[PDB]
Protein backbone atom coordinates (compact mmCIF):
# COMPACT_ATOMS: atom_id res chain seq x y z
CA UNK A 1 0.00 0.00 0.00
CA UNK A 2 1.07 3.58 1.14
CA UNK A 3 0.46 5.15 4.38
CA UNK A 4 -3.26 3.54 5.06
CA UNK A 5 -6.70 4.49 3.83
CA UNK A 6 -7.01 0.70 4.34
CA UNK A 7 -5.90 1.03 7.84
CA UNK A 8 -5.86 3.34 10.47
CA UNK A 9 -8.62 4.84 9.03
CA UNK A 10 -10.61 2.32 9.77
CA UNK A 11 -13.71 2.95 7.04
CA UNK A 12 -15.14 4.98 4.54
CA UNK A 13 -18.46 7.39 4.80
CA UNK A 14 -21.10 6.20 2.67
CA UNK A 15 -22.53 9.12 3.53
CA UNK A 16 -19.90 11.18 1.98
CA UNK A 17 -21.36 11.77 -1.68
CA UNK A 18 -20.05 15.43 -2.06
CA UNK A 19 -16.31 14.19 -2.79
CA UNK A 20 -13.62 11.53 -2.34
CA UNK A 21 -12.34 13.00 0.81
CA UNK A 22 -13.39 15.35 3.62
CA UNK A 23 -13.85 16.01 6.98
CA UNK A 24 -16.02 14.77 10.07
CA UNK A 25 -16.09 17.38 12.91
CA UNK A 26 -17.81 17.44 16.33
CA UNK A 27 -18.87 20.14 18.94
CA UNK A 28 -20.68 21.90 21.35
CA UNK A 29 -22.95 22.39 18.01
CA UNK A 30 -23.47 19.28 16.84
CA UNK A 31 -22.66 16.92 13.72
CA UNK A 32 -20.54 17.94 10.93
CA UNK A 33 -19.34 16.70 7.53
CA UNK A 34 -18.42 18.27 5.04
CA UNK A 35 -16.32 16.81 1.28
CA UNK A 36 -12.61 18.22 0.18
CA UNK A 37 -12.93 19.49 -3.20
CA UNK A 38 -9.33 20.21 -4.30
CA UNK A 39 -7.83 16.89 -2.57
CA UNK A 40 -10.66 14.99 -4.60
CA UNK A 41 -10.05 16.62 -7.82
CA UNK A 42 -6.49 15.50 -7.68
CA UNK A 43 -7.49 11.84 -7.68
CA UNK A 44 -9.78 12.37 -10.23
CA UNK A 45 -7.15 14.20 -12.50
CA UNK A 46 -5.25 11.13 -11.71
CA UNK A 47 -7.37 8.46 -13.25
CA UNK A 48 -9.28 10.75 -15.72
CA UNK A 49 -5.46 10.59 -16.82
CA UNK A 50 -4.76 7.45 -16.72
CA UNK A 51 -8.10 6.23 -18.36
CA UNK A 52 -7.64 8.65 -21.30
CA UNK A 53 -4.55 7.57 -22.32
CA UNK A 54 -5.39 3.51 -21.82
CA UNK A 55 -8.74 4.11 -23.62
CA UNK A 56 -7.18 4.36 -27.22
CA UNK A 57 -7.09 2.24 -30.34
CA UNK A 58 -4.36 2.27 -33.26
CA UNK A 59 -4.31 4.46 -36.63
CA UNK A 60 -2.72 1.45 -38.20
CA UNK A 61 -4.87 -0.70 -40.89
CA UNK A 62 -4.49 -4.35 -40.95
CA UNK A 63 -5.85 -6.68 -43.62
CA UNK A 64 -6.58 -10.06 -44.46
CA UNK A 65 -3.87 -12.44 -45.44
CA UNK A 66 -5.61 -15.89 -45.02
CA UNK A 67 -9.95 -17.01 -46.15
CA UNK A 68 -12.39 -18.18 -44.50
CA UNK A 69 -14.34 -19.27 -47.48
CA UNK A 70 -11.15 -21.10 -49.98
CA UNK A 71 -8.44 -22.13 -47.65
CA UNK A 72 -4.72 -20.73 -48.30
CA UNK A 73 -2.11 -23.50 -49.00
CA UNK A 74 -1.12 -25.11 -45.53
CA UNK A 75 2.29 -24.17 -45.41
CA UNK A 76 1.52 -20.41 -45.40
CA UNK A 77 -1.55 -20.89 -43.41
CA UNK A 78 0.35 -22.50 -40.81
CA UNK A 79 2.75 -20.26 -40.47
CA UNK A 80 0.30 -17.42 -40.66
CA UNK A 81 -1.85 -19.10 -37.63
CA UNK A 82 1.63 -19.34 -36.01
CA UNK A 83 2.38 -15.61 -36.18
CA UNK A 84 -1.49 -14.53 -35.35
CA UNK A 85 -1.24 -16.76 -31.80
CA UNK A 86 1.88 -15.60 -30.80
CA UNK A 87 0.61 -11.62 -31.23
CA UNK A 88 -2.38 -12.91 -29.53
CA UNK A 89 -0.30 -14.11 -26.46
CA UNK A 90 1.86 -10.93 -26.36
CA UNK A 91 -1.08 -8.42 -26.45
CA UNK A 92 -3.06 -10.95 -23.76
CA UNK A 93 0.17 -10.60 -22.07
CA UNK A 94 0.78 -7.02 -22.22
CA UNK A 95 -3.30 -5.83 -21.34
CA UNK A 96 -3.43 -8.47 -17.87
CA UNK A 97 -0.34 -6.48 -17.05
CA UNK A 98 -1.51 -2.94 -18.15
CA UNK A 99 -4.70 -3.67 -16.19
CA UNK A 100 -2.79 -4.90 -12.72
CA UNK A 101 -0.58 -2.96 -12.88
CA UNK A 102 -2.60 0.61 -13.26
CA UNK A 103 -5.07 -1.00 -10.77
CA UNK A 104 -1.83 -1.16 -8.16
CA UNK A 105 -1.35 2.20 -8.87
CA UNK A 106 -4.71 3.54 -8.75
CA UNK A 107 -5.43 2.48 -5.66
CA UNK A 108 -2.17 3.04 -4.42
CA UNK A 109 -2.43 6.87 -5.36
CA UNK A 110 -5.53 7.54 -3.84
CA UNK A 111 -3.81 6.13 -0.40
CA UNK A 112 -1.25 8.78 -1.29
CA UNK A 113 -3.57 11.62 -1.95
CA UNK A 114 -5.86 10.58 2.01
CA UNK A 115 -2.39 10.68 3.52
CA UNK A 116 -1.32 14.43 2.26
CA UNK A 117 -4.60 15.61 2.89
CA UNK A 118 -4.32 14.07 6.48
CA UNK A 119 -0.49 15.42 7.35
CA UNK A 120 -1.64 18.77 6.01
CA UNK A 121 -4.21 19.22 8.84
CA UNK A 122 -1.73 17.46 11.03
CA UNK A 123 0.76 20.41 10.15
CA UNK A 124 -2.02 22.85 9.85
CA UNK A 125 -2.78 22.25 13.56
CA UNK A 126 0.95 22.55 15.35
CA UNK A 127 0.70 22.27 19.22
CA UNK A 128 -3.12 22.95 19.43
CA UNK A 129 -4.04 18.87 18.55
CA UNK A 130 -2.98 15.63 19.36
CA UNK A 131 -3.51 12.77 16.50
CA UNK A 132 -5.89 10.43 17.65
CA UNK A 133 -5.02 7.88 15.73
CA UNK A 134 -8.06 6.68 14.07
CA UNK A 135 -7.34 9.77 11.64
CA UNK A 136 -8.53 12.23 14.28
CA UNK A 137 -7.51 15.35 15.85
CA UNK A 138 -8.30 15.69 19.31
CA UNK A 139 -8.81 19.67 19.63
CA UNK A 140 -7.83 21.50 22.55
CA UNK A 141 -9.19 24.54 22.45
CA UNK A 142 -12.79 23.70 21.98
CA UNK A 143 -13.21 24.35 18.05
CA UNK A 144 -16.69 26.50 16.84
CA UNK A 145 -18.15 25.85 13.35
CA UNK A 146 -16.24 29.16 12.06
CA UNK A 147 -12.97 27.48 13.62
CA UNK A 148 -13.67 24.10 12.38
CA UNK A 149 -14.43 26.12 8.75
CA UNK A 150 -10.53 27.78 8.80
CA UNK A 151 -9.57 24.39 9.05
CA UNK A 152 -10.94 22.80 6.03
CA UNK A 153 -10.02 25.83 3.62
CA UNK A 154 -6.25 26.19 5.05
CA UNK A 155 -6.50 29.40 7.12
CA UNK A 156 -6.84 28.20 10.71
CA UNK A 157 -4.34 30.10 12.73
CA UNK A 158 -2.91 28.12 15.12
CA UNK A 159 -0.94 30.39 17.25
CA UNK A 160 -4.41 31.74 18.65
CA UNK A 161 -5.48 29.08 19.98
CA UNK A 162 -1.63 28.16 21.02
CA UNK A 163 -2.05 29.37 24.69
CA UNK A 164 -5.20 27.70 25.47
CA UNK A 165 -4.37 24.51 23.64
CA UNK A 166 -1.18 24.46 25.08
CA UNK A 167 -2.34 24.39 28.27
CA UNK A 168 -4.57 21.39 28.26
CA UNK A 169 -2.00 19.78 26.56
CA UNK B 1 15.39 31.47 14.02
CA UNK B 2 14.67 28.81 11.78
CA UNK B 3 16.07 25.94 9.17
CA UNK B 4 13.97 25.66 5.81
CA UNK B 5 15.02 22.83 3.06
CA UNK B 6 14.00 22.59 -0.65
CA UNK B 7 15.15 21.37 -3.96
CA UNK B 8 16.86 22.99 -7.32
CA UNK B 9 14.69 24.23 -9.60
CA UNK B 10 15.08 26.03 -13.30
CA UNK B 11 13.38 28.33 -14.92
CA UNK B 12 13.09 26.77 -17.87
CA UNK B 13 12.10 22.70 -18.14
CA UNK B 14 11.68 19.88 -20.16
CA UNK B 15 7.95 18.71 -20.49
CA UNK B 16 7.38 14.81 -20.27
CA UNK B 17 4.35 12.48 -20.09
CA UNK B 18 3.46 10.18 -17.50
CA UNK B 19 1.35 7.47 -16.79
CA UNK B 20 -1.35 10.26 -15.03
CA UNK B 21 -0.95 13.13 -16.89
CA UNK B 22 0.73 15.04 -19.95
CA UNK B 23 3.27 17.55 -20.59
CA UNK B 24 4.47 17.53 -16.88
CA UNK B 25 7.82 20.31 -16.47
CA UNK B 26 10.46 18.10 -15.29
CA UNK B 27 13.94 19.64 -14.59
CA UNK B 28 15.44 17.95 -17.30
CA UNK B 29 14.67 15.24 -19.64
CA UNK B 30 16.69 13.43 -22.49
CA UNK B 31 15.45 11.93 -26.04
CA UNK B 32 14.65 8.14 -26.58
CA UNK B 33 13.87 8.22 -29.67
CA UNK B 34 16.54 8.19 -32.74
CA UNK B 35 15.86 10.69 -35.49
CA UNK B 36 18.93 11.37 -36.58
CA UNK B 37 20.64 9.24 -39.62
CA UNK B 38 23.68 9.61 -41.40
CA UNK B 39 22.64 9.68 -45.24
CA UNK B 40 25.56 7.27 -46.16
CA UNK B 41 26.69 3.44 -46.00
CA UNK B 42 29.01 3.28 -43.05
CA UNK B 43 31.59 0.44 -43.95
CA UNK B 44 34.45 1.13 -41.63
CA UNK B 45 35.35 -2.96 -40.61
CA UNK B 46 33.92 -4.65 -42.69
CA UNK B 47 34.44 -5.93 -46.03
CA UNK B 48 32.17 -4.28 -48.53
CA UNK B 49 31.08 -4.72 -51.87
CA UNK B 50 29.55 -2.53 -54.01
CA UNK B 51 27.83 -4.22 -56.35
CA UNK B 52 27.10 -1.19 -58.39
CA UNK B 53 26.24 -2.38 -62.15
CA UNK B 54 26.39 -5.84 -61.11
CA UNK B 55 23.33 -8.08 -59.75
CA UNK B 56 23.61 -10.23 -57.16
CA UNK B 57 22.48 -13.54 -58.78
CA UNK B 58 24.95 -12.15 -61.68
CA UNK B 59 27.89 -13.78 -59.79
CA UNK B 60 27.03 -16.41 -60.27
CA UNK B 61 26.33 -16.78 -64.12
CA UNK B 62 28.82 -13.70 -64.37
CA UNK B 63 27.48 -11.25 -67.47
CA UNK B 64 30.06 -8.74 -68.38
CA UNK B 65 28.92 -6.18 -65.29
CA UNK B 66 29.76 -9.15 -62.95
CA UNK B 67 33.50 -10.16 -63.91
CA UNK B 68 34.82 -8.31 -61.37
CA UNK B 69 32.72 -10.09 -59.06
CA UNK B 70 32.62 -13.96 -60.03
CA UNK B 71 34.88 -14.89 -56.59
CA UNK B 72 33.94 -12.10 -54.34
CA UNK B 73 34.17 -11.58 -50.25
CA UNK B 74 32.60 -9.26 -48.29
CA UNK B 75 31.18 -9.03 -44.60
CA UNK B 76 28.72 -6.36 -46.50
CA UNK B 77 27.44 -7.01 -49.55
CA UNK B 78 25.20 -4.32 -50.99
CA UNK B 79 22.68 -3.92 -54.42
CA UNK B 80 22.11 -1.19 -56.33
CA UNK B 81 19.16 0.18 -58.28
CA UNK B 82 20.89 -0.19 -61.68
CA UNK B 83 21.88 -4.02 -61.13
CA UNK B 84 21.24 -6.82 -63.66
CA UNK B 85 21.28 -10.69 -63.35
CA UNK B 86 21.69 -10.81 -66.55
CA UNK B 87 23.01 -10.38 -70.10
CA UNK B 88 20.93 -12.03 -72.64
CA UNK B 89 17.27 -11.83 -71.48
CA UNK B 90 15.97 -14.30 -69.08
CA UNK B 91 15.40 -14.46 -65.27
CA UNK B 92 15.70 -16.83 -62.17
CA UNK B 93 13.25 -19.22 -61.52
CA UNK B 94 13.13 -18.89 -57.39
CA UNK B 95 15.22 -15.55 -58.26
CA UNK B 96 14.47 -14.33 -54.24
CA UNK B 97 15.71 -17.23 -52.57
CA UNK B 98 18.57 -17.09 -54.33
CA UNK B 99 19.40 -13.56 -53.44
CA UNK B 100 18.57 -14.28 -49.66
CA UNK B 101 21.25 -17.04 -50.12
CA UNK B 102 23.94 -15.01 -51.79
CA UNK B 103 23.77 -12.08 -49.40
CA UNK B 104 24.41 -14.35 -45.96
CA UNK B 105 27.61 -16.00 -47.66
CA UNK B 106 30.21 -14.06 -47.10
CA UNK B 107 31.04 -14.86 -50.75
CA UNK C 1 30.73 2.22 -38.45
CA UNK C 2 27.51 1.12 -37.52
CA UNK C 3 25.58 -2.52 -37.80
CA UNK C 4 22.56 -0.79 -38.67
CA UNK C 5 21.70 0.08 -42.02
CA UNK C 6 18.50 0.96 -44.62
CA UNK C 7 18.35 2.10 -47.90
CA UNK C 8 18.83 5.84 -47.14
CA UNK C 9 21.87 5.24 -44.62
CA UNK C 10 23.64 4.25 -41.38
CA UNK C 11 21.43 4.06 -37.83
CA UNK C 12 24.34 5.18 -35.63
CA UNK C 13 23.20 5.23 -32.06
CA UNK C 14 22.68 4.30 -28.75
CA UNK C 15 19.07 4.83 -28.31
CA UNK C 16 16.57 2.16 -27.81
CA UNK C 17 14.16 2.95 -30.21
CA UNK C 18 14.47 4.61 -33.86
CA UNK C 19 11.80 6.12 -36.10
CA UNK C 20 13.65 6.49 -39.53
CA UNK C 21 13.46 3.27 -41.19
CA UNK C 22 10.82 0.03 -40.12
CA UNK C 23 12.77 -1.64 -42.65
CA UNK C 24 16.32 -0.72 -41.21
CA UNK C 25 18.32 -4.47 -41.02
CA UNK C 26 21.38 -5.46 -39.00
CA UNK C 27 21.59 -4.56 -34.98
CA UNK C 28 19.25 -1.94 -34.71
CA UNK C 29 16.85 0.24 -32.37
CA UNK C 30 13.34 -1.22 -32.06
CA UNK C 31 11.49 0.88 -34.63
CA UNK C 32 8.42 2.78 -33.60
CA UNK C 33 5.67 4.90 -34.88
CA UNK C 34 6.34 7.84 -32.28
CA UNK C 35 8.42 10.77 -33.68
CA UNK C 36 9.19 11.46 -29.83
CA UNK C 37 9.30 10.01 -26.11
CA UNK C 38 11.19 12.28 -23.65
CA UNK C 39 12.92 10.34 -20.49
CA UNK C 40 12.99 12.30 -17.78
CA UNK C 41 16.30 12.90 -15.85
CA UNK C 42 15.52 15.40 -13.13
CA UNK C 43 13.33 16.08 -10.66
CA UNK C 44 9.56 17.84 -10.86
CA UNK C 45 10.41 21.13 -12.16
CA UNK C 46 8.54 23.74 -9.97
CA UNK C 47 10.08 27.34 -10.62
CA UNK C 48 9.33 30.68 -8.21
CA UNK D 1 -31.86 22.88 -21.53
CA UNK D 2 -28.19 24.04 -21.35
CA UNK D 3 -27.29 27.47 -22.34
CA UNK D 4 -24.46 30.17 -21.55
CA UNK D 5 -25.77 33.78 -21.63
CA UNK D 6 -23.53 36.57 -21.30
CA UNK D 7 -23.69 40.10 -20.34
CA UNK D 8 -24.06 42.91 -23.27
CA UNK D 9 -21.78 44.42 -25.10
CA UNK D 10 -18.99 46.72 -23.61
CA UNK D 11 -16.87 50.38 -24.56
CA UNK D 12 -13.81 51.35 -22.32
CA UNK D 13 -11.14 53.28 -22.07
CA UNK D 14 -7.39 51.78 -22.23
CA UNK D 15 -5.91 51.20 -18.63
CA UNK D 16 -9.24 50.19 -17.67
CA UNK D 17 -10.89 47.24 -16.07
CA UNK D 18 -13.71 45.19 -17.88
CA UNK D 19 -15.82 42.43 -16.34
CA UNK D 20 -17.95 40.02 -18.47
CA UNK D 21 -20.32 38.27 -16.73
CA UNK D 22 -21.71 34.10 -17.98
CA UNK D 23 -24.91 32.72 -16.68
CA UNK D 24 -25.50 29.54 -16.37
CA UNK D 25 -28.69 27.30 -16.98
CA UNK D 26 -29.64 23.83 -17.98
CA UNK D 27 -26.74 21.65 -15.97
CA UNK D 28 -25.40 21.60 -12.15
CA UNK D 29 -22.60 24.31 -11.24
CA UNK D 30 -19.70 23.30 -9.95
CA UNK D 31 -19.57 19.76 -12.26
CA UNK D 32 -17.76 21.38 -15.47
CA UNK D 33 -16.18 24.60 -14.62
CA UNK D 34 -15.52 27.08 -17.29
CA UNK D 35 -13.01 27.87 -20.48
CA UNK D 36 -12.79 31.60 -21.90
CA UNK D 37 -12.00 31.86 -25.23
CA UNK D 38 -11.53 35.35 -27.21
CA UNK D 39 -11.61 36.44 -30.82
CA UNK D 40 -10.13 40.10 -31.93
CA UNK D 41 -12.05 41.15 -35.53
CA UNK D 42 -11.00 39.47 -38.43
CA UNK D 43 -8.97 37.16 -36.38
CA UNK D 44 -9.07 33.81 -35.35
CA UNK D 45 -9.83 32.49 -31.35
CA UNK D 46 -7.18 32.23 -28.64
CA UNK D 47 -7.88 30.29 -25.04
CA UNK D 48 -7.58 32.81 -22.35
CA UNK D 49 -8.25 31.07 -18.85
CA UNK D 50 -9.95 28.26 -16.98
CA UNK D 51 -11.33 28.24 -14.07
CA UNK D 52 -12.98 25.28 -11.97
CA UNK D 53 -16.07 25.87 -10.31
CA UNK D 54 -15.91 22.59 -8.42
CA UNK D 55 -12.37 23.88 -6.52
CA UNK D 56 -11.87 27.22 -7.66
CA UNK D 57 -8.84 26.62 -9.32
CA UNK D 58 -7.65 28.69 -12.44
CA UNK D 59 -5.32 28.31 -14.96
CA UNK D 60 -4.18 30.88 -17.03
CA UNK D 61 -2.39 31.67 -20.60
CA UNK D 62 0.81 33.16 -19.92
CA UNK D 63 -0.35 36.89 -21.84
CA UNK D 64 -2.93 37.19 -19.35
CA UNK D 65 -1.20 36.03 -16.12
CA UNK D 66 -1.38 39.21 -13.68
CA UNK D 67 -4.03 41.17 -15.54
CA UNK D 68 -6.69 38.69 -15.67
CA UNK D 69 -8.92 36.79 -12.71
CA UNK D 70 -11.88 34.63 -13.13
CA UNK D 71 -14.14 34.30 -10.42
CA UNK D 72 -17.46 32.28 -10.00
CA UNK D 73 -21.17 32.30 -8.58
CA UNK D 74 -21.67 34.49 -5.70
CA UNK D 75 -24.53 31.44 -5.03
CA UNK D 76 -26.27 32.36 -8.39
CA UNK D 77 -24.22 29.84 -10.84
CA UNK D 78 -22.37 32.34 -13.16
CA UNK D 79 -19.01 32.72 -14.17
CA UNK D 80 -16.87 36.30 -14.18
CA UNK D 81 -14.07 37.07 -16.34
CA UNK D 82 -12.22 40.32 -14.96
CA UNK D 83 -9.77 41.98 -17.40
CA UNK D 84 -7.58 45.04 -16.61
CA UNK D 85 -4.89 47.60 -17.89
CA UNK D 86 -7.02 46.92 -20.90
CA UNK D 87 -4.66 47.28 -23.78
CA UNK D 88 -6.34 48.81 -27.49
CA UNK D 89 -4.93 44.37 -27.99
CA UNK D 90 -7.94 43.36 -25.90
CA UNK D 91 -10.39 44.41 -28.52
CA UNK D 92 -11.90 41.43 -29.22
CA UNK D 93 -14.84 39.27 -28.93
CA UNK D 94 -15.32 37.43 -25.47
CA UNK D 95 -16.95 33.61 -25.62
CA UNK D 96 -17.20 31.80 -22.29
CA UNK D 97 -17.26 28.41 -22.68
CA UNK D 98 -18.83 25.25 -20.44
CA UNK D 99 -15.76 22.94 -19.84
CA UNK D 100 -14.39 19.62 -18.23
CA UNK D 101 -15.97 16.93 -15.70
CA UNK D 102 -15.36 18.11 -12.38
CA UNK D 103 -16.45 16.35 -9.09
CA UNK D 104 -16.31 12.84 -11.30
CA UNK D 105 -14.07 9.96 -13.49
CA UNK D 106 -15.58 10.07 -17.15
CA UNK D 107 -13.52 8.76 -20.28
CA UNK D 108 -13.56 11.12 -23.31
CA UNK D 109 -13.77 14.60 -24.22
CA UNK D 110 -17.44 14.97 -24.50
CA UNK D 111 -18.05 17.91 -21.78
CA UNK D 112 -14.96 20.07 -23.35
CA UNK D 113 -16.26 23.27 -24.86
CA UNK D 114 -19.44 21.41 -25.34
CA UNK D 115 -21.95 24.88 -25.15
CA UNK D 116 -20.59 28.43 -25.46
CA UNK D 117 -22.21 31.74 -25.16
CA UNK D 118 -23.27 34.57 -27.63
CA UNK D 119 -20.21 36.52 -26.82
CA UNK D 120 -19.62 39.69 -25.29
CA UNK D 121 -17.76 42.74 -27.71
CA UNK D 122 -15.05 44.57 -25.87
CA UNK D 123 -13.86 47.84 -27.64
CA UNK D 124 -10.95 49.12 -25.89
CA UNK D 125 -10.31 52.90 -27.27
CA UNK D 126 -10.37 56.06 -26.19
CA UNK E 1 3.77 25.49 -26.48
CA UNK E 2 1.44 23.00 -29.20
CA UNK E 3 0.93 25.38 -32.49
CA UNK E 4 -1.67 23.82 -34.51
CA UNK E 5 -1.29 24.41 -37.99
CA UNK E 6 -4.33 24.10 -40.28
CA UNK E 7 -4.57 23.63 -44.33
CA UNK E 8 -5.36 24.94 -46.75
CA UNK E 9 -6.20 28.51 -46.13
CA UNK E 10 -9.05 28.59 -48.05
CA UNK E 11 -11.05 25.67 -49.44
CA UNK E 12 -13.59 26.33 -52.69
CA UNK E 13 -15.35 23.62 -53.65
CA UNK E 14 -19.19 22.95 -55.54
CA UNK E 15 -22.09 21.51 -53.21
CA UNK E 16 -22.24 18.08 -53.02
CA UNK E 17 -18.43 17.64 -53.36
CA UNK E 18 -16.11 15.81 -50.72
CA UNK E 19 -14.14 18.79 -48.46
CA UNK E 20 -11.00 17.30 -46.58
CA UNK E 21 -9.44 19.75 -44.04
CA UNK E 22 -6.04 19.40 -41.98
CA UNK E 23 -5.04 20.10 -38.94
CA UNK E 24 -1.18 19.21 -38.11
CA UNK E 25 0.26 19.55 -34.76
CA UNK E 26 4.07 20.35 -33.75
CA UNK E 27 3.98 17.92 -31.24
CA UNK E 28 2.06 14.57 -30.27
CA UNK E 29 -1.27 14.99 -28.84
CA UNK E 30 -3.66 12.55 -27.66
CA UNK E 31 -6.72 11.99 -29.55
CA UNK E 32 -9.18 12.12 -27.12
CA UNK E 33 -7.52 16.18 -26.42
CA UNK E 34 -8.70 17.15 -30.07
CA UNK E 35 -11.78 19.54 -31.16
CA UNK E 36 -12.73 20.68 -34.38
CA UNK E 37 -15.38 24.00 -34.49
CA UNK E 38 -16.96 25.63 -37.44
CA UNK E 39 -18.05 29.08 -36.94
CA UNK E 40 -19.58 31.70 -39.25
CA UNK E 41 -19.49 35.12 -39.57
CA UNK E 42 -21.04 37.00 -36.43
CA UNK E 43 -21.59 33.91 -34.05
CA UNK E 44 -19.88 31.56 -31.91
CA UNK E 45 -18.54 28.91 -32.33
CA UNK E 46 -19.95 25.51 -32.63
CA UNK E 47 -18.17 22.60 -31.55
CA UNK E 48 -18.63 19.78 -34.53
CA UNK E 49 -16.72 17.24 -33.33
CA UNK E 50 -14.51 16.24 -29.91
CA UNK E 51 -12.02 13.63 -28.90
CA UNK E 52 -10.83 13.58 -32.48
CA UNK E 53 -13.69 11.63 -33.95
CA UNK E 54 -16.24 11.24 -32.06
CA UNK E 55 -19.51 13.49 -33.43
CA UNK E 56 -20.93 16.15 -31.21
CA UNK E 57 -25.04 16.19 -30.33
CA UNK E 58 -27.45 16.82 -33.18
CA UNK E 59 -24.28 17.31 -35.96
CA UNK E 60 -24.72 15.90 -39.42
CA UNK E 61 -23.02 12.26 -40.41
CA UNK E 62 -21.38 14.44 -43.28
CA UNK E 63 -18.86 15.64 -40.57
CA UNK E 64 -16.07 12.72 -39.61
CA UNK E 65 -12.89 13.55 -38.19
CA UNK E 66 -10.34 11.23 -38.21
CA UNK E 67 -6.18 10.81 -37.75
CA UNK E 68 -3.54 10.22 -34.86
CA UNK E 69 -0.46 11.79 -33.46
CA UNK E 70 0.58 14.91 -35.00
CA UNK E 71 -2.23 14.40 -38.33
CA UNK E 72 -6.04 14.57 -37.82
CA UNK E 73 -8.38 15.49 -40.51
CA UNK E 74 -11.79 17.03 -40.95
CA UNK E 75 -13.81 15.66 -43.91
CA UNK E 76 -16.91 17.14 -45.05
CA UNK E 77 -18.03 14.33 -47.32
CA UNK E 78 -20.74 16.35 -49.09
CA UNK E 79 -20.89 20.09 -48.62
CA UNK E 80 -24.18 21.81 -48.37
CA UNK E 81 -24.61 25.64 -49.06
CA UNK E 82 -24.80 26.01 -44.97
CA UNK E 83 -21.42 24.42 -44.18
CA UNK E 84 -19.79 27.69 -45.99
CA UNK E 85 -17.86 28.98 -43.02
CA UNK E 86 -14.51 28.89 -41.01
CA UNK E 87 -12.86 25.93 -39.32
CA UNK E 88 -10.95 25.78 -36.17
CA UNK E 89 -9.24 22.93 -34.82
CA UNK E 90 -8.11 23.14 -30.87
CA UNK E 91 -5.77 20.94 -28.69
CA UNK E 92 -6.54 20.98 -24.97
CA UNK E 93 -3.98 18.37 -23.82
CA UNK E 94 -1.52 20.36 -22.51
CA UNK E 95 -2.18 24.34 -21.64
CA UNK E 96 -2.25 26.89 -23.27
CA UNK E 97 -4.56 25.66 -24.81
CA UNK E 98 -4.20 26.25 -28.59
CA UNK E 99 -5.90 26.81 -31.73
CA UNK E 100 -5.49 26.72 -35.11
CA UNK E 101 -5.53 29.25 -37.45
CA UNK E 102 -8.43 28.25 -39.19
CA UNK E 103 -9.52 27.16 -43.14
CA UNK E 104 -12.09 29.02 -45.00
CA UNK E 105 -14.65 27.04 -47.03
CA UNK E 106 -16.42 28.68 -50.26
CA UNK E 107 -18.35 27.18 -52.67
CA UNK E 108 -19.41 27.45 -56.58
CA UNK E 109 -21.21 28.30 -59.32
Known amino acids: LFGAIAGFIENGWEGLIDGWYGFRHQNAQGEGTAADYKSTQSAIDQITGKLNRLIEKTNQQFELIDNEFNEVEKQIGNVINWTRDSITEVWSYNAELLVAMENQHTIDLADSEMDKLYERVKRQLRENAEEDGTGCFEIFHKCDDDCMASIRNNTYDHSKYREEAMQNR | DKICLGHHAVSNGTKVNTLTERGVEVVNATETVERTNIPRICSKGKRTVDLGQCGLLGTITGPPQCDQFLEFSADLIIERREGSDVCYPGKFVNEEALRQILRESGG | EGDCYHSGGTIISNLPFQNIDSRAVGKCPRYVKQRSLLLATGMKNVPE | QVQLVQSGAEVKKPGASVKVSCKTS????????VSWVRQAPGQGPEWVGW????????DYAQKFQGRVTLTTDATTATAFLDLRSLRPDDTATYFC???????????????????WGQGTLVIVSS | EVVLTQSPGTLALPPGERATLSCRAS???????IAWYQQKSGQAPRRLIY???NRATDIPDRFSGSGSGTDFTLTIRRLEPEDSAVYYC?????????FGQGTRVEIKR
Open chain 4, 97 to 115: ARDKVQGRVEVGSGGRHDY
Open chain 5, 27 to 33: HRVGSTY
Open chain 4, 51 to 58: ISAYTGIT
Open chain 5, 90 to 98: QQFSVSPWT
Open chain 4, 26 to 33: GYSFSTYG
Open chain 5, 51 to 53: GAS
